[PDB]
């Protein structure tokens, strides 16, 4: 029933959970409380696919077999600068060093 997400934008990443039946709009609400930005000023993506506010996370492809606590699903975030929404940009994480010779 619960889905585990990583809402990401720039070098910002939010770890939160929600129900599979919860809507994309309600997720924007959770973001509003945290990053102080109204739902109408934010866009949520799933691998460069804009999501509809009326759709459930389940419908959007976020299920218990895809949004697991140990491997949360990623949701793209884009804010509103002037008339045009900014481009979706997710800064990747650093790369781990070379595997130790003893491993």
């Amino acid at each position: 029933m619960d889905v585990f997400l990583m809402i990401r934008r720039h070098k910002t990443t939010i770890f939160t959970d929600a129900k599979e039946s919860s809507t994309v709009f309600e997720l924007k609400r959770i973001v509003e409380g945290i990053l102080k930005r109204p739902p109408d000023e934010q866009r949520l993506y799933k691998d460069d696919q804009l999501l509809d506010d009326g759709k459930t996370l389940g419908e959007c492809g976020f299920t218990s077999q895809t949004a697991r606590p140990q491997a949360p699903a990623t949701v793209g975030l884009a804010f509103r600068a002037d008339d045009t929404f900014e481009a979706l940009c997710i800064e990747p994480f650093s790369s781990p060093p070379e595997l130790p010779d003893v491993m």
Binding site: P69, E91, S94
Partner: protein, 87 residues
Amino acid sequence: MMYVKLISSDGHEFIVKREHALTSGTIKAMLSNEVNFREIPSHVLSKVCMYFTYKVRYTNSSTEIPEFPIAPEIALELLMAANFLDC
């Protein structure tokens, strides 16, 4: 506050629920809204936050618990991060 911000050495900012972060005794003491880790990288701190949701979700669970996956390359750094955070 309902959420807290953990900042990696390379600048990434992770917003996690306060209860979830309290899983770490070190963080539970550091808070006394933001915490800056000059020694923990993003590829490590993201796994730490994933462990927090995992721990809070399964600690009091009668059902079967899945394995917490740890890639070989992140094992040594995650161990040191876990040792410092008391996780």
